[PDB]
Amino acid sequence: VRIEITQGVDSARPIGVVPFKWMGPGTPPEEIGAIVGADLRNSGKFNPIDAARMPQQPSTAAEVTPAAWTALGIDAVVVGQVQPSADGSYVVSYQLVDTSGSAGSILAQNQYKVTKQWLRYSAHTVSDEVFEKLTGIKGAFRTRIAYVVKTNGGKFPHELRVSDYDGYNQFVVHRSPEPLMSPAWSPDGSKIAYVTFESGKSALVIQTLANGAIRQVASFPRHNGAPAFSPDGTKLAFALSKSGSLNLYVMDLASGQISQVTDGRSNNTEPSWFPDSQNLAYTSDQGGRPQVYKVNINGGVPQRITWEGSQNQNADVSPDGKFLVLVSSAQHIAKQDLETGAVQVLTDTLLDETPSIAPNGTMVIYSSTQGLGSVLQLVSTDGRFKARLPATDGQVKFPAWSPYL
Numbered sequence: 001v002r003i004e005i006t007q008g009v010d011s012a013r014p015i016g017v018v019p020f021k022w023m024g025p026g027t028p029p030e031e032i033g034a035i036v037g038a039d040l041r042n043s044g045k046f047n048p049i050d051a052a053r054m055p056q057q058p059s060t061a062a063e064v065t066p067a068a069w070t071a072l073g074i075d076a077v078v079v080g081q082v083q084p085s086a087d088g089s090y091v092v093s094y095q096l097v098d099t100s101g102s103a104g105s106i107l108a109q110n111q112y113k114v115t116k117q118w119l120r121y122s123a124h125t126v127s128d129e130v131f132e133k134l135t136g137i138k139g140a141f142r143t144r145i146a147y148v149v150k151t152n153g154g155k156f157p158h159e160l161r162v163s164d165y166d167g168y169n170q171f172v173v174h175r176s177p178e179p180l181m182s183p184a185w186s187p188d189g190s191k192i193a194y195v196t197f198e199s200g201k202s203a204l205v206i207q208t209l210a211n212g213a214i215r216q217v218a219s220f221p222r223h224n225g226a227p228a229f230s231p232d233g234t235k236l237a238f239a240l241s242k243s244g245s246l247n248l249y250v251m252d253l254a255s256g257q258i259s260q261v262t263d264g265r266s267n268n269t270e271p272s273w274f275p276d277s278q279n280l281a282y283t284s285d286q287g288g289r290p291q292v293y294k295v296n297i298n299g300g301v302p303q304r305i306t307w308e309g310s311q312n313q314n315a316d317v318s319p320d321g322k323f324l325v326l327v328s329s330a331q332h333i334a335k336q337d338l339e340t341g342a343v344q345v346l347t348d349t350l351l352d353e354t355p356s357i358a359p360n361g362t363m364v365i366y367s368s369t370q371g372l373g374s375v376l377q378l379v380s381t382d383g384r385f386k387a388r389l390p391a392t393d394g395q396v397k398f399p400a401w402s403p404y405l
Contacts, residue, residue, distance in 0.1 A: 001167045003042055003251075003378070007386035012047040013134075014073045015040060019051060020080035020094070021059035028082050030119040032092055032126065036078055039127035039141045042166065043362065044385030049074060064097045064104035076107070078130055089115050092122040096130050108133045120168060140165065140358045144402040145365060146173070146183040146192055147376060160194055162209070165358070165401070166391040174214075183400045184227040186322035192400075193217070193236060195225035204238055212274045217251065227268045232277040235297075237261070239269035248282055250297055261297050268293075270314055275321040281305065283313040291383060292326060306336065308343050314354055318361045318381075325355045325364050325381065333366050335381060346383040356401040357381070365389075365399040 017037040022028040027261045040046035051057070055068035059081050069077055080094035092112045097107040108129050112122040123390040128139030143165045151157045156175035160183055174180065178197035186191055186206075193206045202218040206225055218224075220240055235250045243260070246267035251258045262268045266286035273280055274294075284293045284302070290313040295302040305324070306312035312334075315326040321338075323362065325346075328334040333347040333355050349368035351379050364379050374397050376389040 001390045002168055003038070003389060004042070004385050005385075005387045007379060007384075008047075009044055009384045010047075012041075012045055015046045015048050015127055015134075016054060016069055016072075016074045016077040017048045017052065017106040018057050018059070018077060018079045019174060020082050020092070021057075023081055023083040029090070029116050030123065031080075032082055032094075032119065032123045033078070035120060035123035036094075036127045036130065039124060042141075042387070043131060043139075044380045045131075045135055045362075049119075058097075059104050061095050061097050064099065066099035066101060069099040076134060077104075078126070080126070085113070089113055090119065090122075092119070092126070094126045094130075095199040096133060119346065120164065124164075137362060138360045138404070140360045140363070140401075140404070142405050143359060144189070145356075145376075145399055146185065146402070147367075147396055147399045148180050148183065149392050149394045150179075151398050157394075160192070160207075161392075162192075163271075170392075173209065174212075181398055182226055183398060184229055185400055185402050186229045187231050187233050187403050189402050189405045193229065193238075195227070206236070223269075228271050228273055228280075230273050230277040231275055235277065236298075237271040237273065237280060239271065241267075248280060262295060262302060264302075272315055272317045274317050275319065275393070281315045281317050281324060283315065292324065305338070308336075308341065309334075316355055316357050318357055319359055320361055325357055326350060327355065333364060333379060335383075337403065344383060346379050346381070347377070347386075349377055350397075352377075354398055356399050358401045359404045363401075365401050367397050367399060 012277045016031050037048040058064045075095045083091045095109040096107045098107050114122045124141040126140040131139035146162045149159045158180045160173040160180050162225040176198050181195045183192050183194040191206050191208050201219050202222050204217040206215045210305050217353040224240050237250045239246045240249050246269045248261040248271050249258050257294050268284045270283040271280045281294050283290050292306040292312045292315045293302045293304050309328045311329045313327050315324045324336045332345050333352045335344045351369040353367050366377050367374050368377050374395045376396050376399050378387040
């Protein structure tokens with residue numbers, strides 16, 4: 001399993017991630033250093049040096065010789081150790097060491113006790129701490145993605161799947177004879193809402209990941225759905241056409257009470273929340289072709305956001321609420337800065353669909369057509385970095401990036 005980088009950033013910050021020292025006999029159950037290096041490269045903000053070109057492989061700050069690293073243009077080295085415990089757990093230790101002085105200086109350090117299943121998790125935790133210390137931006141390496149796969153054969157061709165952001169640890173959430181679409185994460189990462197065609201008439205359900213339990217929210221015609229959980233965890237937004245056209249509704253999760261949020265004769269769908277859990281961006285066809293609008297759930301006249309381009313839809317509001325990532329259309333992923341109206345087309349892939357922003361706002365996952373198939377694509381929100389997720393055994397659509405985990 002590997003994230004294929006199709007456009008690297010050659011000016012990314014050089015860093016040294018030393019292979020962690022294994023403190024036991026034989027070989028370690030995971031290579032923590034390799035994962036940390038892969039993570040930092042996947043962020044688009046670092047260029048980890050090849051181990052073969054390292055001047056030494058220190059495992060603690062006292063062993064670091066700063067001159068050897070600065071001479072190679074590297075001002076930070078990640079070092080570490082993995083120690084097996086008697087009970088079969090491991091202690092994963094790391095130190096982030098500044099090499100800009102005469103002796104190493106520690107910028108961050110930590111230790112983690114985990115069993116085998118969470119060694120990759122511990123490596124992502126290292127990556128997160130290093131990333132935030134060096135960039136000031138919170139790391140998203142511990143996150144998951146959800147997506148839908150249509151396999152070419154079998155009784156249950158449609159599967160809602162989850163994996164780590166980097167493609168490892170794939171599991172199946174739900175399988176179905178009939179299409180599945182539009183998964184949406186609860187902000188605590190414990191549930192996913194999605195739309196299903198299984199029962200006949202289409203339905204919106206919420207599935208609890210821990211035990212597979214499924215709650216029915218609503219059933220409706222084919223074009224309804226498009227769920228989105230509010231960031232504060234209290235509400236689920238979605239689109240129903242029972243008024244005579246698609247309109248936005250929110251359900252109070254606690255009471256199950258559903259209230260109508262837009263009341264236009266036009267079709268209004270694809271809600272996405274602003275950080276305040278009070279405002280929604282959404283797609284409306286009131287002007288003819290789809291454009292993106294904003295409305296407050298507590299009342300007020302909707303306001304059009306996207307005034308540039310013939311068509312704009314499937315908007316995702318950034319975690320900080322300052323920009324949209326959306327589909328502009330022939331159809332590409334684009335960023336729009338809300339304060340300035342500045343629009344940046346981010347991709348040149350074919351038939352780009354359904355972008356989802358990582359919880360630190362630095363990266364976008366979306367799907368596109370590559371040849372005869374739909375595949376998952378990554379692009380940085382500044383457009384400099386591009387990659388492709390490892391292929392799956394079938395057509396893949398509707399990616400949704402998890403919250404922080």
